[PDB]
Amino acid sequence: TQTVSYPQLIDLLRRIFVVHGTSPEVADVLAENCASAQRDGSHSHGIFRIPGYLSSLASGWVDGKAVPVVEDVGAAFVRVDACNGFAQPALAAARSLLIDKARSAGVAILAIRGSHHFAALWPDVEPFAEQGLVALSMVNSMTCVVPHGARQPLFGTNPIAFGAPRAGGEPIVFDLATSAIAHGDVQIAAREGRLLPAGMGVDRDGLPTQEPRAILDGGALLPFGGHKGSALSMMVELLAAGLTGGNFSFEFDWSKHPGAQTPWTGQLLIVIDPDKGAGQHFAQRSEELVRQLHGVGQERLPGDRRYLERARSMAHGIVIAQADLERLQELA
Amino acid sequence: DQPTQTVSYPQLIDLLRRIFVVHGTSPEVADVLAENCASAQRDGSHSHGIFRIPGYLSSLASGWVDGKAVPVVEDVGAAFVRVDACNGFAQPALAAARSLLIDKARSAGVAILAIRGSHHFAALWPDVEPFAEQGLVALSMVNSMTCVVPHGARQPLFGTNPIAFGAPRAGGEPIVFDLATSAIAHGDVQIAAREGRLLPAGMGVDRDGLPTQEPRAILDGGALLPFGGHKGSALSMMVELLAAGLTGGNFSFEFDWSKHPGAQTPWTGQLLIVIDPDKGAGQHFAQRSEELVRQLHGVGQERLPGDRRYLERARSMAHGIVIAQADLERLQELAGH
Numbered sequence: 001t002q003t004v005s006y007p008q009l010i011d012l013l014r015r016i017f018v019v020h021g022t023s024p025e026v027a028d029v030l031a032e033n034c035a036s037a038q039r040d041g042s043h044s045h046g047i048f049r050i051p052g053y054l055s056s057l058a059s060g061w062v063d064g065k066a067v068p069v070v071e072d073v074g075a076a077f078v079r080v081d082a083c084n085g086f087a088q089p090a091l092a093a094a095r096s097l098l099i100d101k102a103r104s105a106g107v108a109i110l111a112i113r114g115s116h117h118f119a120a121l122w123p124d125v126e127p128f129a130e131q132g133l134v135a136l137s138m139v140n141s142m143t144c145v146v147p148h149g150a151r152q153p154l155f156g157t158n159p160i161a162f163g164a165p166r167a168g169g170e171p172i173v174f175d176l177a178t179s180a181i182a183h184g185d186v187q188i189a190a191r192e193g194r195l196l197p198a199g200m201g202v203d204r205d206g207l208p209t210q211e212p213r214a215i216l217d218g219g220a221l222l223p224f225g226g227h228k229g230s231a232l233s234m235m236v237e238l239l240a241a242g243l244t245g246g247n248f249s250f251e252f253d254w255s256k257h258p259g260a261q262t263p264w265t266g267q268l269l270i271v272i273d274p275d276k277g278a279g280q281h282f283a284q285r286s287e288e289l290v291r292q293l294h295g296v297g298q299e300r301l302p303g304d305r306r307y308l309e310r311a312r313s314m315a316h317g318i319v320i321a322q323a324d325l326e327r328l329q330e331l332a
Numbered sequence: 333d334q335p336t337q338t339v340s341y342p343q344l345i346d347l348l349r350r351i352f353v354v355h356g357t358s359p360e361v362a363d364v365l366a367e368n369c370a371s372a373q374r375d376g377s378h379s380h381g382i383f384r385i386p387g388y389l390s391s392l393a394s395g396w397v398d399g400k401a402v403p404v405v406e407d408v409g410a411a412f413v414r415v416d417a418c419n420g421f422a423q424p425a426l427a428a429a430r431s432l433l434i435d436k437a438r439s440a441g442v443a444i445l446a447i448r449g450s451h452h453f454a455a456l457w458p459d460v461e462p463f464a465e466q467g468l469v470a471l472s473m474v475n476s477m478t479c480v481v482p483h484g485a486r487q488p489l490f491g492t493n494p495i496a497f498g499a500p501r502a503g504g505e506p507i508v509f510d511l512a513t514s515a516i517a518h519g520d521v522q523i524a525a526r527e528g529r530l531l532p533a534g535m536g537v538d539r540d541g542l543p544t545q546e547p548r549a550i551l552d553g554g555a556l557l558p559f560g561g562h563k564g565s566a567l568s569m570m571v572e573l574l575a576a577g578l579t580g581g582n583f584s585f586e587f588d589w590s591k592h593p594g595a596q597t598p599w600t601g602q603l604l605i606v607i608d609p610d611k612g613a614g615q616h617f618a619q620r621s622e623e624l625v626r627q628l629h630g631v632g633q634e635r636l637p638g639d640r641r642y643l644e645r646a647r648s649m650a651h652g653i654v655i656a657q658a659d660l661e662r663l664q665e666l667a668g669h
């Protein structure tokens with residue numbers, strides 16, 4: 001293996017995106033995002049995704065030079081047309097306006113449509129919590145999850161992310177796919193030749209399977225927590241696509257674009273000033289909840305794993321297989 | 333077996349309203365709770381229908397909850413409303429702020445209602461459904477009482493903490509889900525214990541933290557597990573933070589009714605987010621949601637969230653609400669008949 005510093009990884013990835021057609025602005029956003037995931041140990045959404053990013057860009061499936069169009073449509077409502085570009089640049093373009101509205105009105109929504117999201121969601125909500133705001137986000141992906149009780153896939157892996165500030169530490173953040181397992185991890189499991197525990201998916205005939213290959217080859221995934229996770233996944237379709245104006249997870253396909261891997265959908269973000277008109281401090285309440293969680297024995301809270309890995313990465317550098325580093329350098 | 337009888341929806345509402353008034357609630361509170369409880373029974377939401385009347389009354393009799401509390405509606409932002417439930421029920425507080433909340437949601441595009449110091453002893457779908465019937469999307473969270481073990485923990489901390497969601501659809505009743513983040517609702521654990529039966533495995537543990545299917549074992553020093561492992565636990569944590577942390581109400585472990593024999597209602601809070609899905613939009617959300625429903629039937633999902641309740645609702649309006657003869661008599665007695 002090898003070791004690359006966080007800032008070096010960002011520069012390396014930024015060069016790669018520019019070399020492959022993205023605007024400098026988009027390259028800055030994606031490089032920081034991807035590098036951040038690797039820094040935190042979010043393996044299925046770190047450098048593992050570079051090949052997919054590049055194959056998707058090559059066909060024009062996703063526009064690496066798209067210019068987001070921000071629409072100020074309400075005292076607490078912002079819409080942004082991603083114009084077939086990535087979701088992150090669209091969020092970045094409307095972020096300042098969104099925060100101004102959230103702080104002024106108390107809460108504000110950002111509805112992104114026509115966007116491609118190929119990353120973790122915690123990077124989208126954590127920054128808001130770092131600034132003392134609470135953020136909830138939903139993104140619908142690509143069809144591959146069978147609704148509870150159904151016979152064929154329809155929903156995407158549809159993740160939900162939540163970020164909240166705490167007085168005595170880094171933001172409390174959770175980021176979870178509503179599918180029993182993330183598709184990226186099914187791909188990694190297939191590559192490593194590992195079987196999955198029961199309940200993650202079914203084969204092309206709809207029969208339960210533990211073989212990641214069977215799931216990937218015409219099969220499908222199942223929602224986490226049965227009917228409850230399925231209901232949440234339905235909500236993600238409705239909020240990230242139905243409300244934003246973007247495609248539902250089943251309203252697009254890659255058949256005409258060789259190598260395309262990015263979903264072309266949308267994203268919803270709700271940002272709240274938890275202390276608007278409050279006779280207390282939210283950050284103090286959340287800190288107390290953390291103290292109580294430790295008190296009952298929960299050593300690991302959502303996000304802890306990443307924060308520990310993050311600290312390691314900043315102190316000793318990001319561990320990367322020498323082979324992967326060389327590949328990135330050649331791509332750059 | 334217990335002989336049964338039917339009572340119409342309006343008759344049940346009148347009966348429950350009388351019960352609440354006779355037992356110390358204001359008329360506004362009685363109207364709201366009577367309709368809410370009766371509506372749950374009508375839809376077949378047993379754990380939050382008339383089954384809850386005894387708990388409501390014992391909570392009121394003990395002085396734990398103020399049945400005559402007057403909600404204080406606080407307009408704190410263009411899109412933000414807070415309500416001090418003043419140790420009263422959550423539903424009357426929501427009713428007091430409903431019009432203002434809707435005005436803000438339609439004007440600003442989205443609006444939040446943060447209720448603090450409230451007691452919620454019911455289903456959450458009654459809270460979000462009305463907004464959806466008016467073309468708005470609503471998401472709500474309520475934290476309850478400590479009994480759920482956080483993922484990886486050894487003792488309970490979170491409440492059953494439900495999340496509810498309602499959205500309009502062009503060709504039918506609102507799309508609505510209402511789920512506890514625990515593996516089972518505490519109310520249904522009580523019903524199982526009452527009926528002397530066991531629960532499915534993998535939903536709770538006994539006082540020693542060992543798996544159990546005995547509802548009594550869970551109720552007597554035991555605890556429930558979050559649904560869907562670590563993900564359900566994360567969602568439950570979110571509910572504590574949103575329904576209590578953000579509103580100002582107590583977390584599920586921050587209230588004690590040991591000094592109020594008979595108290596059963598959590599004294600916490602509730603968060604509601606109401607959105608105009610078409611604010612500044614170039615499309616119609618209701619059309620998009622109808623398409624999703626069509627696609628869901630297309631892939632074979634016959635039962636969508638809410639369908640079971642809408643079916644029971646239809647049966648109740650056509651044949652009346654089925655009620656055990658003994659339960660009806662008890663309700664009639666409580667009403668004064």
Ligand SMILES: NC(=O)C1=CN([C@@H]2O[C@@H](COP(=O)(O)OP(=O)(O)OC[C@H]3O[C@@H](n4cnc5c(N)ncnc54)[C@H](OP(=O)(O)O)[C@@H]3O)[C@@H](O)[C@H]2O)C=CC1
Pocket residue numbers: 042044045117118119120121122139140141157158159173174175176177178181182183300301302303304305306307483484562563566
């Ligand atoms: N459309 C898109 O862009 C999609 C993106 N994804 C992404 O892939 C992802 C990985 O998601 P998923 O597989 O669901 O992730 P997991 O199942 O690993 O994690 C869900 C989360 O659970 C918390 N968690 C995990 N294990 C524990 C534990 N033992 N105790 C307490 N908390 C725990 C995590 O913390 P922690 O982070 O510290 O490990 C995190 O918030 C996300 O980053 C997601 O955004 C997935 C589908 C679609």
Ligand SMILES: NC(=O)C1=CN([C@@H]2O[C@@H](COP(=O)(O)OP(=O)(O)OC[C@H]3O[C@@H](n4cnc5c(N)ncnc54)[C@H](OP(=O)(O)O)[C@@H]3O)[C@@H](O)[C@H]2O)C=CC1
Pocket residue numbers: 148149227228231377379380452453454455456457474475476492493494508509510511512513516517518519635636637638639640641642
């Ligand atoms: N603090 C409080 O006041 C608390 C209240 N509760 C209440 O008790 C409750 C009952 O909750 P819980 O036990 O989680 O409910 P369930 O596990 O029954 O239902 C969750 C929900 O799942 C949908 N659903 C259930 N089964 C299926 C299926 N097979 N296919 C598709 N969708 C399905 C339901 O539809 P559908 O409605 O049609 O049945 C509903 O939206 C709620 O009403 C809740 O609000 C729970 C904890 C705390």
Ligand SMILES: O=C([O-])c1ccc[nH]1
Pocket residue numbers: 044117118119141142157177181182183184185263
């Ligand atoms: O891993 C997944 O499920 C996924 C879909 C889109 C991005 N990641």
Ligand SMILES: O=C([O-])c1ccc[nH]1
Pocket residue numbers: 379452453454476477492512516517518519520598
């Ligand atoms: O059924 C439950 O879990 C519950 C708690 C408060 C009201 N209902």
